[PDB]
Amino acid sequence: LSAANMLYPIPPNATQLPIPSRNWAAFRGWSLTRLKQRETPALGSPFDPY
Amino acid sequence: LSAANMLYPIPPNATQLPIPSRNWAAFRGWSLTRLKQRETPALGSPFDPYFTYSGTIPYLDGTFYLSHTFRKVAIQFDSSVTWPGNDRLLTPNEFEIKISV
Amino acid sequence: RSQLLGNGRFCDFHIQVPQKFFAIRNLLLLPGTYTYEWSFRKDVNMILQS
Amino acid sequence: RSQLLGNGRFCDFHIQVPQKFFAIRNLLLLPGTYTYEWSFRKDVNMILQSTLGNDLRVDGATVNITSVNLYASFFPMSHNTASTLEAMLRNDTNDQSFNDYLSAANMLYPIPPNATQLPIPSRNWAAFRGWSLTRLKQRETPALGSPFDPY
Amino acid sequence: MTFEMDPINEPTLLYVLFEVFDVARVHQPHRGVIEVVYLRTPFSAGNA
Amino acid sequence: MTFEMDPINEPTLLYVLFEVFDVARVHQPHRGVIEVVYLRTPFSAGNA
Amino acid sequence: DPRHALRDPERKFLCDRTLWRIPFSSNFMSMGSLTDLGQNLLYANAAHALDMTFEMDPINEPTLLYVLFEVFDVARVHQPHRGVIEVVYLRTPFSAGNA
Amino acid sequence: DPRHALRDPERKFLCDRTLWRIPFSSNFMSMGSLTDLGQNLLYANAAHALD
Amino acid sequence: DGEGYNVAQSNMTKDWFLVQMLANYNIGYQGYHLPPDYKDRTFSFLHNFIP
Amino acid sequence: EIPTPYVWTFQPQMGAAAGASQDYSTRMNWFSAGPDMIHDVNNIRDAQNRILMTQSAIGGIGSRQFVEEFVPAVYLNPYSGPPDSYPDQFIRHYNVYSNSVSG
Amino acid sequence: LPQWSYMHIAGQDASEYLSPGLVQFAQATESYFNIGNKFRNPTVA
Amino acid sequence: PTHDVTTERSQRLQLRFVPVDREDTQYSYKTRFQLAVGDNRVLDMASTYFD
Amino acid sequence: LPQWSYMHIAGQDASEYLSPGLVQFAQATESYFNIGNKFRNPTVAPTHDVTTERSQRLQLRFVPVDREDTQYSYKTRFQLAVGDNRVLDMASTYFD
Amino acid sequence: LPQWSYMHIAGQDASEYLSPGLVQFAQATESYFNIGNKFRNPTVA
Amino acid sequence: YYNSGGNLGVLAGQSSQLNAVVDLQDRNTELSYQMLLANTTDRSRYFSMWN
Amino acid sequence: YYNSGGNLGVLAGQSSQLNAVVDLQDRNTELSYQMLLANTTDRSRYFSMWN
Amino acid sequence: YYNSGGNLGVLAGQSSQLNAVVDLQDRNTELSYQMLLANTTDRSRYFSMWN
Q: Which residues in chain F are contacts of K3 at CB distance < 8 A?
């Protein structure tokens, strides 16, 4: 895959979604989609209570 | 003290906080803490109209008390070479101040 | 410091403020005349503490 | 300027305010990012002006700022040339220099009512350019320095 | 970046993927000794 | 200086203007770096 | 007590009126004001870019990240004649801001 | 408090188990048991009266 | 007070305070600072001075 | 006259270094000194450029071999020369085969 | 003195204290892009 | 020592200077003094303060 | 470099960059009039034969190669290995 | 740059940055034991 | 706002962080601008844009 | 006032006129002073004079 | 467990003790594996062993 995974929340009924970030170098390209919060388990923690 | 004082805002509930800057030479080291905006008077100007506080000013008297609110710090030069690197720490990619799990 | 001024609301103080600027703190001036000026705040929220 | 806004009490204005600070008025910034911040008063008695000079603050004079944007025009200069220009302007030997047109320290000494004589002590360690002076009415002179004048 | 999408009656997420170079070399000098060196550029170790 | 003026039935002010040299140089070494050096002589930083 | 109900441990700490330190030395020890790394050619020869990322606990109010780039803020005072003070400051790195 | 009445400041101090000192030196500093003045000819030569 | 020749926020003159400091810790000609502990015994000045 | 040498920042990748710029992190401020002082300051600085002058004469290159080379070079007087011979290589976003161009 | 010379309060003019290249450049672009006001010229009596 | 330490001629130990100019601003106070160090003397800033 | 040497950021000490006369004077007046704080003394650190340039952990972690949990005792054996060109000071070791 | 060259993000291929011996060995054992995936080959545009 | 340390404008590079705008309540930008215009152009014509 | 270009203190010879005090709002004198005391003396005792 | 610093897997030589597995919750191994298979084989067939 070779890519940094990012996740930004999209409030219900939201339409516009800005995302600020800055790269000091040059990568390869972008790749994106859309997922449902309920269907996405919060990783990083050894357990998701919600 | 011998050190340049910098202040970066930390939005409420914010967790991550990146800071870009570059030194052309070599200094001595880093030193840091955390302060509350309300308790920090905006210096430089001969008067602060939004300064409604009269308690101790950690920024001056040095009464810090929020050093226990840091998780980790990551330093990198030229946005690639991590410091100190060389696999010095148990976690060579950063300085973990405290772990939850 | 509080009691060092008194317990009354009104109080006629009298203090001695030292020089803190390193460049001239421990400096050893030589014979001659110099202009030594400096400003002092008046903002109660910075000169006083509660 | 009055009619430039209209004849009605209520009016949705829209203006363009220029930069007056000499140090940056005619400055020629180079590539890079900079933080450009600035404050704006709201005191009707300073942003607005009246023929009679009546206290607008008491005569129900109010203003409200909805949005503020910053515009900047860039010359469509060739990247090749623009690059060369930058290289030169980045040398200490070619640093830009400006100087306030007025160039003078502003002083204000009170003149009691009916007063005739007015002495003023001060001392300069060097040599300036010259003197310049006039007379103003206290009531017509807002106390600057403070973010607000209650009197 | 500014993404304009259709409104949905439920919380969602914008899954972005900054394609980069997540490479790592493995060096084995002696018996029972593994020395690896990772390197993901850009985004070496987060952004700040 | 001693200014003698006509009497007025209201508080006034004597606006003086010590013409000087309020100049400042702007130095830009690197990208996104502005170093300026002001200098108003006489009256560098007030009088005392 | 025998009536004790199943619990769970929780650790933490406090460190006030103090400043977190991260000396710029190869061994983190203090072997002189002018560290060894602060005198290494890799830094004095060419210029670099720095980027730090601080992860901290969330607070329900605006805060600030007070950083302190320890440097050398020294100044020499020269007095040639009567009533004449000539001083020369020098703070390196960060001579006069960064740009 | 707003019910405060006009008052007046009053200063003083205390210094117990101590003795007021007035060294017989030209600068009041201690540069040795045998002070400088205590070795000045003006005193070793002729006698004086103290009051 | 008159001129206010008092210091330490007390009623003690500036002249006296100076003398006491010099005769006890030789401190006064180069700034007034809390002398080292070993020199502050129960029979010292500053140790018992309480404005 | 006596200017301030440039600084070369090593590029972790490629190893082709980058654009050099007049240092400013070690600028010895002194415009608040005296005449003989302002005279001696440019003297010691001249000796500096003097040393870096001799120190200069003597894929991508690594860092260890980068400190030995690409040393701080002093560009004497300003643009002086014609519009043909300029720093060029001292520009960050500049290539050899073509003119400085970026997307 | 070096204090004024630096701030250009007195001394040589832009057409002298500036790099030869930059000078002529301005003279040539004295039509579309002007940069003559960016540099101060000292006037001593 | 009994020579090359203290002076024999009259001379104050601590001088007092008055503001040659003072401006009371709405939120700041500025004063300028003409700190004069007499000849054959040496002043150690550390011993100076604002009363 | 001449920039630091002048500001005394590095180089000789006051007892060397100062005039011999002034030096001894301070040493003599080290009672009444002090002027030792007026002159700064540079303190530089070594830049070789101290720390290594190659990668190397600061503190290693060892796992039991064998452990026996007895009814009233617990024994564990480790293979504490001190890499070449290294020196371990037991005092810095402990059982987690 | 040396940062990529080392990580093989760009530069010579396995058939070059590898020891001649190891290269041919893989080519010969391209039947039973394969070790071609163990070495990355950079592809620059 | 001009010549007011209370609301001094900022204009510095994000990397530098050092404000390049140093104002003093002693200077007078407003008036300065006025006179400037009356010297470079005919201060009798009107120009809505700048009011 | 400290570390404020708006009210920077002055200390130069009348003949020189060149201010020897160059401050930067990047430095922090206040805090600097604090730490300094905690390294040279016992920051537990009290000294009215300096409050 | 993957991409979880909380339960990061270990794989180092007993003599080295230096873990060779450095994971970041920023990476996504799971998905990465999926796409990998769909590029080297026909992701339509089944294989019980790997489910």
A: 39, 41
Amino acid at J23: D
Report CA Rg, chain F.
19
Token pair 């560009």 is at which residue?
A: J75
User: Which of H26, H32, H39 is nearest residue L6 as measured by Cβ atoms?
Assistant: H26
Question: How far, in Å, CA of Q40 to CA of M68, rounded?
Answer: 48
Q: Which residue of I has its CA nearest to P45?
A: I34
Strand pairing report for G86-92 and B70-77: unpaired
In sequence order, the β-bridge partners of residue D105 are: F18
- Residues sharing a CB contact under 8 Å with residue F6, sequence separation 6 or more, in sequence order: D116
L32 at F interface, C-beta within 8 A: yes
Examine chains B and H and say if they touch (3+ CB pairs below 8 A).
Answer: no
Distance CA G33, CA D131 (A): 52
Instruction: Provide DSSP, P14-49.
Output: TTT--------TTS-HHHHHHHHHHHHS-TTS--GG
What is the rounded CA–CA span in Å between residue H19 and residue I49? 12
Q: Give the burial class of B19: count Cβ atoms within 10 A of its Cβ; 0-12 exposed, 13-18 middle, 19 or more buried.
A: middle
Give D35's Cβ-side CA count (13 Å radius): 15
* Nearest residue on chain D to L31, alpha-carbon basis: D122
Pick the closest to residue A43 from Q19, Q5, B13 (CA basis): Q5
Between CA J25 and CA M48, with CA G35 as vertex, the angle to 5 degrees is 120
Range list of H helices, N1-45: 2-7, 14-17, 20-28
Distance between CA C44 and CA K17 in Å, rounded? 50
- Determination approach: cryo-EM
Q: Cα(D143)–Cα(D150) distance, rounded to whole angstroms?
A: 9
User: Which structure tokens are listed for G77?
Assistant: 């005072």
Residue entry with tokens 């363009």 = D16
Rg (chain E; Cα; Å): 19
Q: Contact, G49 vs G68, CB < 8 A?
A: no
Distant-in-sequence, close-in-space partners of G41: CB < 8 Å, separation ≥ 6 = J67
Measured in angstroms, the resolution is 4.5
Contact yes or no for G62/J21 (Cβ under 8 A): no
SS percent in chain M: helix, strand, coil, step 5:
25, 10, 70
Decide: K8 and F37 in contact? Cβ < 8 Å.
Answer: no
C-alpha radius of gyration, chain J, whole number: 16
